[PDB]
Design a protein around this ligand. Sequence first.
Ligand SMILES: [Mg+2]
Ligand SMILES: [Mg+2]
Ligand SMILES: [Mg+2]
Ligand SMILES: [Mg+2]
Lengths: 198, 198, 233, 125, 222, 4, 196, 196, 204, 212, 222
Amino acid sequence: MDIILGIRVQDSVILASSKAVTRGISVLKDSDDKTRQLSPHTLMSFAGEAGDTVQFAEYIQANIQLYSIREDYELSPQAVSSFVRQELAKSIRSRRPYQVNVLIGGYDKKKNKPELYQIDYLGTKVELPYGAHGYSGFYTFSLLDHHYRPDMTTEEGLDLLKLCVQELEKRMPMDFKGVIVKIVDKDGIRQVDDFQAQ
Amino acid sequence: MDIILGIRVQDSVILASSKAVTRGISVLKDSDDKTRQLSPHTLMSFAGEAGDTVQFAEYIQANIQLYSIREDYELSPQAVSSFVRQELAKSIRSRRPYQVNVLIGGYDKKKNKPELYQIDYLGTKVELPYGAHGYSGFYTFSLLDHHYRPDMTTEEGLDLLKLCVQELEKRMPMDFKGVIVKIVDKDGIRQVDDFQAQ
Amino acid sequence: TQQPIVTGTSVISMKYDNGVIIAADNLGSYGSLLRFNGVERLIPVGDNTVVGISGDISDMQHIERLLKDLVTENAYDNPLADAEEALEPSYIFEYLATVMYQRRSKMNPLWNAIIVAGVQSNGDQFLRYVNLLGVTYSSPTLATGFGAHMANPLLRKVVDRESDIPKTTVQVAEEAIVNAMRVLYYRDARSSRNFSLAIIDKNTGLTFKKNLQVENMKWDFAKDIKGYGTQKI
Amino acid sequence: MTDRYSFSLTTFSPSGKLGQIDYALTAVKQGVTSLGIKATNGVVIATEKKSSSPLAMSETLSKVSLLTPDIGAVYSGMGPDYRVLVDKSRKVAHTSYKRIYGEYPPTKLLVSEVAKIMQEATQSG
Amino acid sequence: TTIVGVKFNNGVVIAADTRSTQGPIVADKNCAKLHRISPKIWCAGAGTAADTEAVTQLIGSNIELHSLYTSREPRVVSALQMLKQHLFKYQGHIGAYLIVAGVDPTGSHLFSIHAHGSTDVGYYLSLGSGSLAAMAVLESHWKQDLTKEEAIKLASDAIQAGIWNDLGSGSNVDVCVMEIGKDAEYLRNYLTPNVREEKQKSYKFPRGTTAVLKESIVNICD
Amino acid sequence: IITX
Amino acid sequence: TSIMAVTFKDGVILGADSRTTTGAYIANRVTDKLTRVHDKIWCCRSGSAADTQAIADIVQYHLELYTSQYGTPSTETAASVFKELCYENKDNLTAGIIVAGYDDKNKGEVYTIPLGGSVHKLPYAIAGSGSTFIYGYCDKNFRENMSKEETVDFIKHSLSQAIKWDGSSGGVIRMVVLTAAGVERLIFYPDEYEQL
Amino acid sequence: TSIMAVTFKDGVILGADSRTTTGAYIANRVTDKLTRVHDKIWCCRSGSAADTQAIADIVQYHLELYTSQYGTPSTETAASVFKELCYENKDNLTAGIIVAGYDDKNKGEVYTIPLGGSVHKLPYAIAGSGSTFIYGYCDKNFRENMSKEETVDFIKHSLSQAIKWDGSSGGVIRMVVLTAAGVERLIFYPDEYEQL
Amino acid sequence: SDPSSINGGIVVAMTGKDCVAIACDLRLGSQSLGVSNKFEKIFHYGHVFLGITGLATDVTTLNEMFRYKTNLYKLKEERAIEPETFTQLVSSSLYERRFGPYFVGPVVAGINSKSGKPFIAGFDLIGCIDEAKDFIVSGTASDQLFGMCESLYEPNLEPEDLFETISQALLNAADRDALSGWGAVVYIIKKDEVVKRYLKMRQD
Amino acid sequence: TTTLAFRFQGGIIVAVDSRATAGNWVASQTVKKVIEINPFLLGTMAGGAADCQFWETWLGSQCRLHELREKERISVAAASKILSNLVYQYKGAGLSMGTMICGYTRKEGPTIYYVDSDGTRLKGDIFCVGSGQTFAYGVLDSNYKWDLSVEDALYLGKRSILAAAHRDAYSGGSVNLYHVTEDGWIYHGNHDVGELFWKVKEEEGSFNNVIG
Amino acid sequence: QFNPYGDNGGTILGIAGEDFAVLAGDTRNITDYSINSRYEPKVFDCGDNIVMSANGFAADGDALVKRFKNSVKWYHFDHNDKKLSINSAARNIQHLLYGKRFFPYYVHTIIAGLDEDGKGAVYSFDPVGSYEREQCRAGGAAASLIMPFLDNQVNFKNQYEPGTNGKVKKPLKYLSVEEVIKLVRDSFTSATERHIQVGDGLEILIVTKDGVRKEFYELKRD
Ligand SMILES: [Mg+2]
Ligand SMILES: [Mg+2]
Ligand SMILES: [Mg+2]
Ligand SMILES: [Mg+2]
């Protein structure tokens, strides 16, 4: 599958996501962004079936954007996620479930704390220091289980992600073409343009 | 699948074969040599089912070595291949066919010309300027159909292989971990130790 | 790799203070066609054993043959064939057990369920079962097919454990056996009214009764039933 | 064909009165008396049996009705409207309560449910 | 599960065992298989636990409402017709197998309903995994004109047959006697022959055996 | 069949 | 299940066994598979118990309403209702039914509605699992305008054979006689029919 | 396929229809399903034509060699041969066979080997698709020690019924009479058996 | 594919002397992969507790559903819902989806504020109600729990004792189940107060 | 299951967990997954319990016979190819085993071979095998370095199993450590995860996704 | 199609003490929902102070037990009356079992006895041979129920010493035969409460240097 990792440090949430889109025998693109900004302090990464993926993400985007306007306010990360979970949990029992898994990383301006939530296509949500979807978790959780510390700086988290990325490149069968990293903190969301070589 | 390419230049045959062995979710090794020297001027590359691969290779090796000694002579490449084909064609109708594909690149010291034969697990044999097994051919044959010239030098062939590898690293989904190249010419068989960076 | 064709239903049995009784009807069914009405399925081996068999008849018939041969061949160079070295129920059973498990293990079973009832040289009652899979077990009561479901509960109300055997009489026992048989005729669509019963007593020896019938039947009450609920007449 | 009467039949008059409601209340005024007194260990509800003929059998008419085994109702007004209010009242005691909690509704809630039925007849089309 | 019904001279009684299973595991060692449809109409159910209770509550409810609407005591043929028609609508998906009996203004009644909605009437019936052990007994000892006393025994024994000879049954026996004049009597745990023997040891662990990490109080009110 |  | 209906000079008689099974277990050995849909229009039921009860229950209803509105329904009409249900719902029903009734102008009548929902009017008819066995006997021993006594016998013998061979039949033999004289309920025990 | 064999005072008679079908096509409408395995030991064949021919052919051989070595074989022996073949090869065969022959000491005899290869000796037996329809008639019209003329009739009627109801039977009725007086071949045409 | 075996987890509740206790494990995983070491499965609406094992998405969904249903109830009735009643709500709420159930195994525990008697119950995924006097077990380790309970249990234990018992029951049953464990929580329930204790347990 | 063996300066490390499962049922937590063939040869097991125990105990025999026959101790290459060729003969019958043959010989030096029931036999320096292999690799690969001290190696191999024991439901029980040197294998204990996890958390300060 | 296998229920448990070991098993034998026998032993004395039980498909269990006793018979013959130590019996069984790896003996077997040093020993096998020596083990239907209990009550898992902040495990003492039998009885009554295949009777075989002793207790028959 595609890679989706997220790691919540002390003052931010870093989401790293693979840049490859493959179909059948060929890699169609090597620069895909498997992310949508739900609100200025909430980013959601996604992975799953072909179309469902973006379709689901863009739909959740629209809805959160609409709320933001109607209320001229920004839902807490916890709020967006629950909303997301419910859209999925209702989908699993529909005619054609959205087969998407998402990681939601947001910076809660009220509590002034970063948050990361993992929710699968079934609407299974949970809040975590770091998480992943697909097979990636199968190497990274143990890696992070070992090297992670709650008081890490954003820089420290980036380096930790690096490790995660190196291990995945070493042992995973698919060439996912690297990842795109993004940090969600008090000042919003920014893309680390320097991760292909830091 | 794993990568098996072979290209016959003017005075040699260059076989390129991927360095990875993956099983399930992990790449177990990144330095495999999917090749066996049948005789001092004959090299065979192989790919297919997990065990059948080396087992068939080593068996063919043993048989060719034995003949070499019983007659203190080296069978022509063409001979070695016809032999291999028949072993395959007999296997295809056994209880458990060897599911192995091979490329045989040998220097025919009598005709003083390099040769390359492509044989599939069904005992389908053909002689070619360049060949491949698996999905690689799907990219390389057209690339070669365009960039290949009968009068190329060993060095030119290597560069051509380089192009092939690049195209494959760009568009194939699996990280095959690079290739090991070997040249079969009048003076024998040697492995290009400098291909990971030439 | 087979599928029974002509079949025979339950075989019921129980052991009492000085012997054992066993019974089975005389029907050879062909699916839902009650085809053959004169099939003895209780097989007397010698003077101290009766083996009742249910399942595919052709295989039963084969086991009949195996049993006669077992007898023939025990007489051979056996001066004591009609005495001390006569076929005991346990010998017959272990043989049959052995064959069943060997045929199952070869994937070509003898499609039957068998109960071997008899009494040993020293007077002990013997009652044990073996079937197409080689599963064997013993109890004061034993039955195959529907009899396991219906007969066992009845036969057990008389002999619930070992200690009850010495307190049970032939009369009690045979009574039970015939009732169970009646029950089965009522609820088993594949039963027949005609049956065979056999007792093997440590004193009277082997008594084998042929041509018994289910009697004392309560069917009179059927007249006061009309409809399936709301119907009045 | 079809109930094309899709608009309210009870509207607001320029004085803020809901005509049809005040009127129904008049119909209520014209009906026989019924009362209820509550004690510390019980409640009683009573009414008169206005036998509409000595040829009619008084017993074949329950002005007092059981809604649940712990709740009763009596009225004053147009009897038929009551009868059907009882039906619905007994049914809703089940559908919105016994069939969900396995116990009968408490009075206020059952009341609340009857009440709702009536309000709707004050607004529905 | 093992359930029976036996009609007697002036009524009908029903009984059932008290074992419920989730496969080969005993879920409930004493569930109640007898259901009150109306004061004098009871049903014994076997099959899917929740279905028997659901279909029983539902029809009991609609029965209560029919009584109130008609100012008459409920009749068994009504419960019978409603159950049947509900079950039939569901083509067997509501795995309810029931023996519905009771007394009403028209007499004493005994019927059986299968999950596909077919009904039967008889003087004695049984259903359940234990249906055969019970019927065996019934077919052995029933006779016409049984006393309340005899029927109770007959029914009780049958359930015992099931308890003993059927793994799909067990624990205790419950009876409900519905006699024509008197109030229906529900004898829950009429018989209790499977009492677990006193344990050999006591595993009251000395306090402190368990390792606790953090301890806190919960807020229960608003 | 135990596994590992 | 073993059922048949035979018309005769005075009317028609419906006969059937009384066995209901779940495979080879006998669910009920004293069933009544002879069901009334109208005072003098009865049907013999074979197939699914549920399906046939369900169908019969509905035909009774339709006929009751028919009565109230337009008077006494002909047998033919009883059949049409059955046919309608059986045909229009063929994919979900396993019911083979025989309809027979008595009328003053038409005397006795028998209609058979097999699995496809087709309807056939015949001098007599037989159906149910045990029927295959008596095609021969019945075709040999049946004559028209028989007498009550004769007809009762033919049915009694035919069904006795059917019960003999078919394991899905058994119990007692119930009959229903329909003539101007009314409606009579007959029953015959095993100890009598068995040794015929 | 409709076949039967009936023993009587003078011996036994074998009878059968003459229809072979591939599905619903009548491959041969004048087949002979009555086959000789010995001078006075015949069999009635039903099921796979290949299999039964195969089996008969082998039994004839076994009996021929039996004769040469140990003299005339009893019908019971002809039956055990068939049995042996049918039982031991139960998985690859579809043959229901009725064996019948005449002997001086044993008069007439009839053995039936159904699909499982079990063997059954009876006063008479019936087999084949069309058999199901005459179980009743036959059980009702068969008496022991009948006479040739009587037995010919019983067989003639029973088969005619079978031919009537079963589409898998028809053609002509062939019989084989086995008495001390020899072996006689009887044939009955449609224009005679049909309206019986 | 078996919804009931994807995430893993167990719950068990017992009744003591004027108390009840209900505990659970903290694991949430996807087959072999342990994902969350912090997934509680015991919830409470006022003084009524409900533990739910099964498909995590459904666990979450039903909690949310029961909060909603309990909240409204309180507004209409003007008193907190009781265990006996909540149980019926759960049952009916489950049977409502008879032919497309929530893959869960709820457990209710609490003490009636009116009568004070301890109460606990369990339900199958479609509503069958199992009201027991001793204990209720649920989850991937149901068998194991049934094993621990049936033996370790004895009537009328005091709060402090019941704790040990319920704890050892859960703890040891979890250790024989791959999909459960990773931490545990126990609730000791009394009229007046309720205590929540976390347990040290094998983290494998 | 979860097993690893890796090569380095001071030799080879072989660490395995000790859980046996029957589906989700934890069948045991006291299974030895390392079979000591001869004083210089270890075979690790993963897959069907019986398949591994059986064919590896057998391997042990064939190794001994070779000793008797040639007077020389069997090489790891040869020892491994026996198992491998054996397994390949049964290919397609359902044998399930993934194993590593680690050992030291004067001729080959420290050596590790991975051999699985598919017939793949490979030589390498680091292999983690089993349902928890990824978990082990994660930890192993990130801290592995050739110049590791024997003590640190032990700990690392140990830790990696710990890792997998935590995350992989199918691994657990306790870690068994082995050090293979110029002078043979040296057992370095059986460590119960039940206690090892907690000690490691406190001392190292990791596993913060847990509180205690 | 013919299914060569079946399940006859039952449950067995083995516990090794310091100078003894026991192998207990229930006495019921079933098939689907019917009880085949309330008394059909499955724990046997195989000579040489070795008790064994192979629980699962009785036919297979029987065949296995037969082949092993016989292996013991021939061990005496071929190796001049030498006594088969338990460790050796174990390995022998591994081979008996693994010989049928491609058409297994569908059974879970256990044998108990004293080792070469006289200390108690229990060994258990996977249907195709995996085996190990253990302190205790249960097998069969109610295995999942009983096993956790033993881990706790026999091996003292999860039990720590009071007032040590859960940092000191309970002293791993060794139970006496008396205590072991108490545990065996409880484990069995419990198992009978919840498993429909377990019940009727419990037969324990105690093994000491003084030979093999048999104890029998009744169990619930529902
Ligand atoms: Mg019959
Ligand atoms: Mg469970
Ligand atoms: Mg666990
Ligand atoms: Mg029972």
